[PDB]
Amino acid sequence: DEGQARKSQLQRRFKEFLRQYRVGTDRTGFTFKYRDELKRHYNLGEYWIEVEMEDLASFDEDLADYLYKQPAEHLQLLEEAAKEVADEVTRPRPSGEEVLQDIQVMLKSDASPSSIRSLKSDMMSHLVKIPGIIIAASAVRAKATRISIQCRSCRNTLTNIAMRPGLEGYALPRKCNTDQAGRPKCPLDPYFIMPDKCKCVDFQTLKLQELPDAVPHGEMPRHMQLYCDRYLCDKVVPGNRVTIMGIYSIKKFGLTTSRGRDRVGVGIRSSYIRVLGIQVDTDAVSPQEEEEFRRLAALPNVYEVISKSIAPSIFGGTDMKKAIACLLFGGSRKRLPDGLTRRGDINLLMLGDPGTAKSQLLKFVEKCSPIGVYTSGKGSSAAGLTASVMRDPSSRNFIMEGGAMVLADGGVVCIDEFDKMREDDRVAIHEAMEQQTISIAKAGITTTLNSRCSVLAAANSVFGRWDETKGEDNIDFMPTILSRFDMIFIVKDEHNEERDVMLAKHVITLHVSALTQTQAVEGEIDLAKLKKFIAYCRVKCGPRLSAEAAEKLKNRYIIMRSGARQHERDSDRRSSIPITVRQLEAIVRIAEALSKMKLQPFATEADVEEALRLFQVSTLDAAL
């Protein structure tokens, strides 16, 4: 009774918070924020809301303190209050919407996060805020919220038994409640779960790795298990950087020591986090963002603005920064009626001298790309890059795990030290670079995966520094791999008095400026916005060449082929850099990328002119 009274009072306070909370001022106006959000979400068929802890503290500090210290009970009370308020906001309801739905209440806060390493025993059963990286996600499974049980002998049924949230089970009644007289006694453990009477929700399990910068020196990164349910399920994927609010909890399995439990230490338990809210970190588009993106795409010098924003810390490399912008946006993937596909992704290779910021460029593109994976050729294998076959520990069966080019599907994979890769490992990438699939036939698995990613590779020349006398001996790659690159840049560290003085002053100023507090630059776009702008354009615009632009491209391609053919004849050596139909389609992709920057449905002659200029400076220069 007294406990019931206390619970009812707390639920009433949560209900009043939901009914009365307001944002605004008497000069402007007022909005009942949470009541309105609940009403709109329920009408949309989305039975969840997100509540800020600061708002709750503003309304009632004690309620927020209780929610922080004892999250489970008070969160249950808050959900019941949310259900009550959802009935009142929507209470006269249309036919087929009679039954009131449960409301999931998500939690959000402005507090500073805490690390995995800082999670101690004294914080058990508390509300915690943790940053990390998603490294693994399980399949979506069913978790019972309500069960009905029936007696084997007498068919006596107990219905609507509530289940605990999280990774917690239930202990069935030991004995039945039927009358002792007349009937032979019911057997021990008489109850079984009725399949069709059970109410279930979707659940998921995740692994959260600590942030790379938080790892103590010389230690392998640690991870933690996450439990997600209902609308939190299937929100994040491996590779996402997130901040999670949750309950630090313990797995509650059977009390019995079944199979003769024989742990290496006594009284140990398994920890996990019961997730109450997820926030994806930058490192859907609001209408304000969409309007801002449309404004950027319409700037007459948008191409210059984007190029200036790519690795602004690097001193020069304007042509290579322009080509990287095209790679980030990409071309238009197409499927012809016969079923054959033409890829829209752009591949770029930087081959050149040491200390020319090739690795710094690759690191930037990893941060800038909406989907980006950085790997090293030396530290890679054929199975690691594409996909692997291995034994599943639980099932005792063969499974498949994706490599770098599966994790980078839909984005960019940056392969540094490309020359150090073994020939057998390099050759495993040919199919993925052109057909954009990975074919596997191993250990009884015959399947095909998607690998629609752009390759950005860096390498050194054969003799360390490019030697003009050695000629074609500077390049070691086969013609097959080189023909799969849209643009090939030969980077030569040219020594000049005037440029060297300018570069040195830039580098010194860069090191001194590390102390300066960060400031915006008028002519550039910050990385966070550029990252979002790229993602928006790739989903919204797939351009095509205009009929006039195609005629211009056709005529220049024929000239380029004749010049390459003539050059090989005169030199008596077949050139290392080939000029094939793939290079014609490469120019099409680069032209479409330039249009996609401007959100233009058709690529013009100016787009083809710029695409041909980029090709001239990159690949024709290498080939001649």
């Binding site: 106006g29 007022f30 009541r35 009142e88 929507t90 209470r91 006269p92 309801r93 249309p94 036919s95």
Partner: protein
């Protein structure tokens, strides 16, 4: 019609103010506004009341129906019934918004009043949603909506009327 124009119509309702100035009877085209005497109550249109309050010339008095007990009874009655119940004012939402935004210092228990008016608004909006769904689903040609205020109709009227126009044209396709 937009919401600003419904508010314009609502601003013609009469409220009571206590001025701190003296003025002779004003012969407005709309109608006479009695003499103004400091400390004594007088009835004026809502627009003039708001203007005088903003200029620090008067103190507003809550309408008779802006009472917590009465409003609670009205909200309970609205929740119990199936149709729309008669409202204390034909512009209760606009009057509440204007009065509570500009004169909360003059109206005790303004927060409770605002919450009760919000409850009534939500219930009535849901009833209107049910009415529209029934109109379309059952293929009606006419409906009765008594005790529904102008602001409530205007909140979704254009959408409903456009949908009904399209549906009527689809119902009369086969007639040559």
């Amino acid at each position: 019609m937009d919401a600003a124009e419904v508010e314009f119509l609502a601003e013609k309702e009469l409220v009571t103010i206590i001025p701190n100035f003296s003025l002779d009877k004003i012969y407005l085209i709309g109608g006479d506004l009695g003499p103004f005497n400091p400390g004594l109550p007088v009835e004026v249109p809502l627009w003039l009341a708001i203007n005088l309050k903003q200029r620090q010339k008067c103190r507003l008095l809550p309408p008779e129906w802006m009472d917590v007990e009465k409003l609670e009874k009205m909200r309970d009655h609205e929740r119990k019934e199936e149709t729309f119940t008669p409202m204390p004012s034909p512009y209760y939402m606009e009057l509440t918004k204007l009065l509570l935004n500009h004169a909360s210092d003059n109206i005790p228990k303004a927060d409770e009043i605002r919450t009760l008016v919000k409850d009534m608004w939500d219930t009535r909006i849901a009833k209107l949603r049910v009415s529209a769904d029934s109109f379309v689903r059952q293929q009606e040609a006419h409906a009765k909506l008594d005790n529904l205020t102008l602001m409530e109709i205007n909140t979704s009227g254009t959408f409903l009327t456009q949908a009904l126009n399209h549906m009527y044209k689809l119902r009369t396709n086969l007639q040559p």
